[model samples]
Target chain A: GSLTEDGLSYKEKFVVRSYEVGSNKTATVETIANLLQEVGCNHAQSVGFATTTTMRKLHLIWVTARMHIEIYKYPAWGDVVEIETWCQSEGRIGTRRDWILKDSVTGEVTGRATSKWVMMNQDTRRLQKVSDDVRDEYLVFCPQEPRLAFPEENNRSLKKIPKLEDPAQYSMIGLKPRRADLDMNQHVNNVTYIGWVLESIPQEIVDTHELQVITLDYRRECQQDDVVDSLTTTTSNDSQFLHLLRLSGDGQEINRGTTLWRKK
Target chain B: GSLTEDGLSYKEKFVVRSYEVGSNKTATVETIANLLQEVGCNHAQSVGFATTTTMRKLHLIWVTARMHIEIYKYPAWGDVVEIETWCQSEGRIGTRRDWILKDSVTGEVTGRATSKWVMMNQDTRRLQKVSDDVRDEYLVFCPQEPRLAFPEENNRSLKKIPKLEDPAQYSMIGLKPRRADLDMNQHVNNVTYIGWVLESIPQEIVDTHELQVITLDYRRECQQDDVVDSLTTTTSDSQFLHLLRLSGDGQEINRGTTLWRKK
Candidate 1:
């Protein structure tokens, strides 16, 4: 990724892989989420703020706390996508990263995403405050004026995803992590969480609709051994649903999500 | 992928992605398989033999009938891997493809793979003989002398993977395909079959050993709605196991596999 002219944002180009697409002949929502994550990490590494060994030495790691993505269109297989990302302080303990995805050839905006990340002690598994030294290392890349993908008042205040309790309209239980689901972090990848969230949606909805907007609230990390249960509750609106992922044994929350869909 | 100087084999370079690695910090066997598939398809596309639409028009699709892969080492994340692949005719009904994987900087060979593919009618779902026209398209790339990664007689004759009947020691049932598991063909991607093969292995074995070699016989295709079961049985050799995947309802066979591990 190369820094933009202002030197505050970084941009990278990617060609959609064949396996990244689905039956729709376009990239899946999970693929888009992964691209966003990749660009964010690349941006940090470019600025010498985050490297696997560097962060390990500091006993610190970044964990996604929340993410909101709005897709106007999905790029097709073999299409080149240009992603630009920048980060800013989100209070003392958290940071905000935003992205703009464009078609490399046409230069048209295709999608937008924003996410919140918090620091955590790698070994202790406890949340940590962003230290001054670490903050300053990344703060140099932050623009004086913050930029956001979702600038609308309503979008800026994305409501918290409601927790779905027992007796959900739809439920899928005993979901185990495939060996492939674990990323380099030795935990279930954040993108895999999105797939679990949709596992409980009625097949009818999946067959007839396409996902347009998704908001994820990651509550806790999931390990390989944790068997999971996915629950979903249909909202009054035909195209809206609420989702929850929890451990099957203790019912500890893993993630909560809300999805908006449109007819295919 | 660019045509090699020999003008027969095609080669491509790839940087292993972070998500492709497991806890070992190296590319998983499944990742290697995906890369091989990518290069093979690119080669076909480069030669005008196969495109999604073109193949659909021909009412034919390539399906993996058998594969044998030997891994010397796994590539680490961010490491560039160079893979060279070529194809040759395998008897009257099947075609063979071989691959050699290397570390781009060191140019050291990391793995070798050879696979057998057969053509199937898209609409009928029955085996089809490779027409002369299709054969000529890809055979032009075949070298006068076939190159074998495993030239030894025993390796040349990969023993058939025996079916593991019921009463298996280990079994994982009710495995369903995830939405992401489906590829452009609307069937479960071939790479996903490897994961299911490992699901039934004892966790103790998985924790202590790494996969070094795997051979698979893909007897049939698996569809999205099929409820599947994976079964495994221990062999006299501690490092080897026999695996089978089948439909849960009718017990229709989907794939048979044999995996060899080394301590």
Candidate 2:
């Protein structure tokens, strides 16, 4: 198996802000991606390479897949999560990377994730085999190390809500389609959209309100300039609000979405 | 009118990052407040103070009202906005302050704001008259020439948001207040409330989809832990969403709210 310096890697410490955690009270994708970039940068720096976002373009290959995540415990809004990533092992065609997330204040391991990547040429954008030549180059950054034992049996990921088409299917009842609702994504940052959806809810009744819980399971990617229509259908129980969002165009489903809300 | 030094009345510049613009395609309030704070802090060494979230606790209290903004051209994503702020004149009751928002690339004065404020006792939070004793002490930092001529007319401010109960009335629908949401004022940072109103939409969708147009209108002041709720209401051919925030078990409403739409 091709491994770098015996499986060493990158690590970063981050504070868990409110916008980062809701009711499910776990780390967010943004945090996950940020950690990936941090470790990716650390490894690159150790191996002597620029760790900018453009690294993907330079390498011409992007990491993807198993996209596997194991959550042992979800941190609340204020708890800090320390994340450490290491090159676990190697595949003939690609390299395997894994991460361990621990709570700094408590010294508890909260979660772990493993992701796989295949290098490709910048021009052709095709995959390349993991050559010892490349793995050796990587080890300079990883430095060989033995893998720490961790629970590997739990593989359950949250079930994703599906992206449904047919505007008629989404109404407070039918699904809305493509251009009818082209949202602003380029200049506008995300999270602001959740504010938009929440605006649609009737919460003015009185002395009652609590964002008790809100969760979104994003299905597809919203491009930089691609226009998309948003269809949201919500169901609520005494304790929470469940919302589903789907985007599509030209009769093709583009994304699936879900939001869970908690009430006070 | 008593003012700062003959040549240093707070002049600082800011290059607005593209991310600072809100749904209206203009710089958001929090961005502006941040720029102002930056200006104050840049001069902190000479002012003899620590970096704090409160203006009342400072040697000078800056208040803002009456603003007029003209969008020569709306800023796009990644487009930077250059901002300039300074003291115009000192009065018996308050000081006149000014702001100029310009396009970094174009250098055109895109928008300007004029405001008023008075010095106060940091401990008691009471208004302190800027007496000659205080005026003499402040003059050390005043710049002789003002930045931009006072606006032909004071901005007089837009519709200031009213106090209300329950965040449901305001528009931060998707946002719930966090402890960090609390600012130096022991309330949701007023500027953050503005950011919340502008960021009513979910980020996941914006990253995954493309959007066309958006508009935001801010109506009120919200304190910390206020259940900030956003409302998206559509009538006729348009849909508008606003935020209604509540505090003290429905004793007050933080602000009116901002409205947004995608075309």
Candidate 3:
């Protein structure tokens, strides 16, 4: 069961299990995303914002727009990590959510993430303003300033990265989406995109590098059974890697990301 | 946090999350396997059987040999299911385990599974007879009669389904294992085999059929780079089907199957 402390925030403790980690014996970036989603959804579902069934009654759904995660340290298998997350209104149309991860054993901070979300009219599949009925259902916990500072009002929106211009400058790998990739939405989950992005990187880099920060700007959704070609590029001595996910069927871009890796 | 009930058994409740379900919007067979593993490990760790650190010291570990599950109904996403499991000494070298799955909302028994386990000498990777110290570590809750009836003494071992002699007789699907398929042991997880087997069947059949029972006898383990060929065959009117999982390299065998029926 999840706990809501003093009605200010909600938190849950999770034990990093064997099936959750990667070859490095530490939880993957996608695992963090999945946990964050779980906590965020738990918070909402607890406050009566609406259950999936209720939301479906009115054809309303929440969709993540952009997110940034910074991993100071990754938790290993058998390690217990606690996640605390809260939501605050972002103007009238979107909501801003933030999360803090802590080492349950050592009581040390491990990672943090901030994401932006919007309610969409499922019938129209377009963004919708948070209605009074919905707004009244939420109990704003942290109405004060967010845990992490945001960009200046003038530049808060994420800047889109231009598609790659030269095929020769980047190395590419082709992948087929499996049934396991699909979530309840019947489309490939956002976490799968991160997996595909890392798959395109050089093996030497993957084996030696550690991701420090990543800014994912999701542009479009990829469905199951799509053949996705992921492209990656990095300078010989640079720590930053650029990625582009595109559909192999028509060469349309799916998402683009810039990741900072720490020297191993 | 986990709840350890009275001395008789251990139980936990799980809300079937979206990631744990399949196309039918119900929990996947592998999801159940993963949870059972969790409870079984929890039971051992609670009883101070051993930890990863101690196993390194004694070169001891538990291994799954064979199991059978009967699903009365599949739990849907957002559905809460309570699983109560217990272990008892099977014999000198093995133990018998049982699990009962119930709908949290209605308290209806939805599933039951029983498995047999043995200790393996990790260094040599061979089955070992249970020693006195190891046998004493376990707390046998049910000592008189087994939770479920055992098969007839004469033919209890799972019948071996020979490799497909003619690929043309069955439909085939090829799959490449991924990083996500690896479990704690670092090889392909057993649950993935169930998923791959279902993937080989036509979607129409998958959408219509409900798996009532399964008896799996794992032969060889699959690695990350293995290209697996999942083969399926069935009689025109029979509800039961035969499945064979083989590796693409030299047609090596992986798992033999006996899947039981329902419309």
Best by TM-score: 1
Candidate 3: give the clashing pairs. none
lDDT of 1 by residue, B1-263 (tens): 58888788899998887778877789989999989988987787667655344456788878888878888889997789999998888667777889999999999999999988888997898887777566666667788686876678877236766666668888877777878898876789888888788778787876667777788778776778776788778765254455545555545444455444654
Off by over 4 Å in 2: A1-264, B1-6, B9-29, B43-71, B74-80, B118-132, B143-150, B154-176, B179-187, B197-223, B229-263
lDDT of 3 by residue, B1-263 (tens): 24355555678777777677777778877777777767766655555543344445678876666677777788997798888887777778587777888999899999887776777887787777776565654544444555553345544343444554544345545565555677645677766766666565565655567666665655555656666677666634233344544445545434445444446
Residue-pair clashes per candidate:
0, 89, 0
TM-score (all chains, Cα) for each model:
0.90, 0.42, 0.79
Candidate 2 lDDT for residue A243:
41
- The model with the greater TM-score, 2 or 3, is 3
Candidate 1 lDDT for residue B163: 64
lDDT of 1 at A132: 74
Residue A183 accuracy (lDDT) in model 3: 69
Candidate 1: where is the Cα deviation over 4 Å?
Answer: A5-7, A49-58, A165-167, A236-238, B5-7, B49-58, B131-134, B141-145, B165-169, B236-238, B247-263
A35: Cα error in model 1, Å: 1.8
Worst-scoring 10-residue span by lDDT in model 2 chain B: B232-241
- Among all candidates shown, the one with the greatest lDDT: 1
lDDT of 3 by residue, A135-173 (tens): 655535455565453344643235455555556245544
Error of 3 at A178 (Å): 3.1
